[PDB]
Design a binder for this molecule. Sequence first.
Ligand SMILES: CSC[C@H](NC(=O)[C@H](Cc1ccccc1)NC(=O)N1CCOCC1)C(=O)N[C@@H](CC1CCCCC1)[C@@H](O)C(=O)OC(C)C
Length: 329
Amino acid sequence: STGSATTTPIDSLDDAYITPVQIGTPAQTLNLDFDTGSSDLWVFSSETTASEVXQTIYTPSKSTTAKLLSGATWSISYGDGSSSSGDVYTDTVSVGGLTVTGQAVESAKKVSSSFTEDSTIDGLLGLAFSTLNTVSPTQQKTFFDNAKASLDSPVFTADLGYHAPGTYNFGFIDTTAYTGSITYTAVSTKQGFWEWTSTGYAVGSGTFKSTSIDGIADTGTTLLYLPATVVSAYWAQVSGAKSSSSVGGYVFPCSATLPSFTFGVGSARIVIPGDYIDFGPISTGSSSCFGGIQSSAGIGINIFGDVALKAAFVVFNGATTPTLGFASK
Ligand SMILES: CSC[C@H](NC(=O)[C@H](Cc1ccccc1)NC(=O)N1CCOCC1)C(=O)N[C@@H](CC1CCCCC1)[C@@H](O)C(=O)OC(C)C
């Protein structure tokens, strides 16, 4: 089997991407953020504290296939400090025509304020390794892990758009979705992430510096977070750019033409167009824009978030030894 679903930016800034997911019988369609940086499929629900719901909710008592996972609970917090918790059902979950039975669907009893405040995100579908799942006492498998037995190939691909719809595919590689060839690179699962080592970078038309950058491919992070020295090298080529303590990162004049940023995948190179590194105005009508490449020093992990990933066709190869592939597009 395979599945193919359209993923859409939630807003004009490409802050996040949502993908429809059908849960239960009859299907309840929720728009979830597919997050390769976590491993829980959780949803706003009929159990969620009413004052914390503003979203489409899952109602397990309306699904004939929902089963309570007795005694199971979950609690998660994310890199941006958001959080949620609740209890656990198993149910039928379909993405893009690919159906998994017995998927753990974590039903939120409570969600943090940023979840309430974001009308467009009805929950998360985690696609990191199942060792990060937060269900206790027994961790639950991701949708991808449960699908692998039936998939035509144990892979999923992310094809995120720049201010445009894109695609998540499960079980196959669409050879018409990218140019050149895919280059694969090794993945370490020691921290549960799609963690890999970039071979280096270049700014604009300058030289490629071979410097190992250990980081994660995270569809659930908006920006590209890289080492401070790398980020400084990038913004040094933008004459108006400066770090702003009050705004919380590099800011620059919206009228600037930004250089591209190239990162290495083995011998291959992925080029992020300059425009992709313009995240957008700090407020509507501002002359100042926030940078799409920021220092990872405060997070402690380098993160190839959506600014990077949307410049590529990205293959998440979930064979027993996983690998990560990148192609230009
Ligand atoms: C240091 S990593 C910070 C990352 N969050 C983000 O990148 C959020 C995503 C978002 C945008 C709009 C609305 C809601 C959420 N954006 C954000 O913090 N931004 C601040 C900088 O300007 C750009 C937007 C994050 O926590 N990612 C989560 C998934 C994310 C899904 C959406 C809801 C909130 C949680 C996950 O990938 C994670 O924890 O990754 C860690 C392991 C790096």
